[PDB]
Amino acid sequence: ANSTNSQSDLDSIQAEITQRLNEIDRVSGQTQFNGVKVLAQDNTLTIQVG
Amino acid sequence: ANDGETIDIDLKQINSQTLGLDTLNVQQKYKVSDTAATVTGYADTTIAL
Protein backbone atom coordinates (compact mmCIF):
# COMPACT_ATOMS: atom_id res chain seq x y z
CA ALA A 1 0.00 0.00 0.00
CA ASN A 2 2.93 2.41 0.43
CA SER A 3 2.89 5.46 -1.82
CA THR A 4 6.69 5.10 -1.69
CA ASN A 5 6.42 2.31 -4.29
CA SER A 6 6.42 2.60 -8.07
CA GLN A 7 3.85 0.70 -10.11
CA SER A 8 6.65 -1.50 -11.40
CA ASP A 9 7.29 -2.33 -7.74
CA LEU A 10 3.59 -3.14 -7.35
CA ASP A 11 3.90 -5.69 -10.15
CA SER A 12 7.15 -6.97 -8.64
CA ILE A 13 5.46 -7.65 -5.30
CA GLN A 14 2.55 -9.25 -7.15
CA ALA A 15 5.13 -11.76 -8.35
CA GLU A 16 5.94 -12.98 -4.83
CA ILE A 17 2.28 -12.90 -3.84
CA THR A 18 1.52 -15.25 -6.72
CA GLN A 19 4.47 -17.46 -5.76
CA ARG A 20 3.06 -17.77 -2.24
CA LEU A 21 -0.33 -18.71 -3.66
CA ASN A 22 1.23 -21.31 -5.96
CA GLU A 23 3.17 -22.97 -3.16
CA ILE A 24 0.12 -23.02 -0.89
CA ASP A 25 -1.91 -24.73 -3.60
CA ARG A 26 0.93 -27.17 -4.29
CA VAL A 27 1.10 -28.21 -0.64
CA SER A 28 -2.69 -28.49 -0.53
CA GLY A 29 -2.72 -30.86 -3.48
CA GLN A 30 0.36 -32.93 -2.71
CA THR A 31 0.04 -33.54 1.04
CA GLN A 32 -1.41 -36.97 1.74
CA PHE A 33 -1.56 -39.65 4.44
CA ASN A 34 -2.10 -43.27 3.40
CA GLY A 35 -4.00 -42.25 0.30
CA VAL A 36 -6.02 -39.52 2.02
CA LYS A 37 -5.89 -35.93 0.79
CA VAL A 38 -6.39 -34.32 4.18
CA LEU A 39 -6.72 -30.84 2.64
CA ALA A 40 -8.42 -31.58 -0.70
CA GLN A 41 -12.06 -31.81 0.43
CA ASP A 42 -14.46 -31.42 3.34
CA ASN A 43 -14.55 -34.84 4.95
CA THR A 44 -15.52 -36.71 8.10
CA LEU A 45 -13.47 -39.74 9.15
CA THR A 46 -14.84 -42.06 11.82
CA ILE A 47 -12.43 -43.98 14.05
CA GLN A 48 -13.75 -47.18 15.64
CA VAL A 49 -12.81 -46.91 19.31
CA GLY A 50 -15.17 -49.42 20.91
CA ALA B 1 6.41 -38.27 -3.46
CA ASN B 2 4.94 -39.54 -6.74
CA ASP B 3 5.49 -39.43 -10.49
CA GLY B 4 4.92 -35.82 -11.54
CA GLU B 5 5.19 -33.76 -8.34
CA THR B 6 8.12 -31.49 -9.16
CA ILE B 7 9.05 -27.78 -9.15
CA ASP B 8 9.94 -25.86 -12.32
CA ILE B 9 13.21 -23.88 -12.45
CA ASP B 10 13.72 -21.58 -15.45
CA LEU B 11 17.02 -20.40 -16.96
CA LYS B 12 17.71 -17.71 -19.53
CA GLN B 13 20.78 -17.12 -21.67
CA ILE B 14 22.75 -14.03 -20.70
CA ASN B 15 25.33 -12.28 -22.88
CA SER B 16 26.17 -8.94 -24.44
CA GLN B 17 23.85 -9.75 -27.34
CA THR B 18 20.86 -10.95 -25.32
CA LEU B 19 21.26 -7.81 -23.21
CA GLY B 20 21.60 -5.73 -26.38
CA LEU B 21 24.73 -3.95 -25.15
CA ASP B 22 26.88 -5.66 -27.79
CA THR B 23 26.20 -2.59 -29.96
CA LEU B 24 27.36 -0.07 -27.35
CA ASN B 25 30.00 2.38 -28.56
CA VAL B 26 30.83 5.87 -27.27
CA GLN B 27 33.22 7.10 -29.96
CA GLN B 28 32.64 10.06 -32.26
CA LYS B 29 33.90 10.34 -35.82
CA TYR B 30 37.10 12.33 -36.24
CA LYS B 31 37.57 14.85 -39.02
CA VAL B 32 39.36 12.99 -41.81
CA SER B 33 42.34 14.61 -43.53
CA ASP B 34 45.02 13.34 -45.88
CA THR B 35 47.63 14.25 -48.49
CA ALA B 36 48.59 12.83 -51.87
CA ALA B 37 50.96 9.86 -51.68
CA THR B 38 54.29 9.72 -53.51
CA VAL B 39 54.41 6.23 -55.03
CA THR B 40 58.14 5.53 -55.01
CA GLY B 41 60.14 3.64 -57.60
CA TYR B 42 59.52 0.09 -58.75
CA ALA B 43 59.01 -3.45 -57.49
CA ASP B 44 59.94 -6.76 -59.09
CA THR B 45 57.27 -9.18 -60.32
CA THR B 46 57.00 -12.83 -61.34
CA ILE B 47 56.89 -11.83 -65.03
CA ALA B 48 60.02 -13.51 -66.36
CA LEU B 49 62.24 -11.61 -68.78
Closest CA to A34 of A45, A23, A24: A45
CA angle A45, A46, A50 (to 5 degrees): 160
A30 interface with B at CB cutoff 8 Å: yes
φ and ψ of A43, to 5 deg: -135, 155
- Evaluated on CA atoms A36, A39, A40, A43, the torsion sign reads positive
A32 interface with B at CB cutoff 8 Å: yes
What method was applied to determine this entry?
A: cryo-EM
